[PDB]
Amino acid sequence: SSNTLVEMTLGMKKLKEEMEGVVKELAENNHILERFGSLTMDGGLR
Amino acid sequence: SSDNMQHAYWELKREMSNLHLVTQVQAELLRKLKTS
């Protein structure tokens, strides 16, 4: 189904790139937590 | 061709593994944070 299949290929390419972006941002979040994070009984949204 | 679809698929699966990993790193990190 070559017209629907070309879009499947490009679709999978785009999903990969988006996933890459999410991984990068999650790693940046992890870096913030690694340096500055803590868990406290009365932490959270204040 | 049909091959390039297989390659895009492989790369997508490969990136999913990276997503699983960064999520598991985050889980571990939460376990290791200071508490008070």
Numbering used by the authors:
A (entry chain B): 679 to 724
B (entry chain A): 215 to 250
Paper text:
OPTN is an ubiquitin-binding autophagy receptor, which is initially found to participate in the xenophagy and aggrephagy processes, and more recently is also demonstrated to involve in the PARKIN-dependent mitophagy. The N-terminal coiled-coil region of OPTN is responsible for its interaction with TANK-binding kinase 1 (TBK1), which is a noncanonical IκB kinase family member involved in innate immunity and autophagy. Here we biochemically and structurally characterize the interaction between OPTN and TBK1, and demonstrate that the direct association of OPTN N-terminal coiled-coil domain (NTD) with TBK1 CTD domain is responsible for the OPTN/TBK1 complex formation. The structures of OPTN NTD in complex with TBK1 CTD and the related NAP1/TBK1 complex solved in this study not only elucidate the detailed molecular mechanism underlying the OPTN and TBK1 interaction but also uncover a general interaction mode governing TBK1's binding to all of its currently identified binding adaptor proteins.
Analytical gel filtration chromatography and ITC-based assays revealed that NAP1 TBD can directly interact with the TBK1 CTD with a binding affinity KD value of ∼0.72 μM, which is roughly fourfold stronger than that of the OPTN/TBK1 complex. To further uncover the detailed interaction mode between TBK1 and NAP1, we also determined the high-resolution crystal structure of the NAP1 TBD/TBK1 CTD complex. As expected, the NAP1 TBD/TBK1 CTD complex structure consists of two NAP1 TBD and two TBK1 CTD molecules, which pack together to form a symmetrical hetero-tetramer. The hetero-tetrameric NAP1 TBD/TBK1 CTD complex mainly adopts a parallel and compact four-helix bundle architecture, which is capped by a short anti-parallel β-sheet formed by the C-terminal ends of two TBK1 CTD molecules. The overall structure of NAP1 TBD/TBK1 CTD complex is very similar to the four-helix bundle core region of OPTN/TBK1 complex. However, in contrast to its continuous helical structure in the OPTN/TBK1 complex, the C-terminal region (residues 715–717) of TBK1 CTD in the NAP1/TBK1 complex adopts a short β-strand, which directly augments with the β-strand of the counterpart CTD molecule in an anti-parallel manner. In addition, unlike the dimeric OPTN coiled-coil domains in the OPTN/TBK1 complex, there is no dimerization site between two NAP1 helices in the NAP1/TBK1 complex. Further detailed structure analysis showed that the interior of the NAP1/TBK1 complex is stabilized by nine layers of interacting amino-acid side chains that are mainly mediated by hydrophobic contacts and polar interactions. In particular, the hydrophobic side chain of NAP1 L247 buries in a hydrophobic pocket formed by the side chains of L711 and L717 residues from TBK1 to assemble the unique hydrophobic ninth layer, which is further stabilized by a pair of backbone hydrogen bonds formed between two S716 residues located in the anti-parallel β-sheet of TBK1.
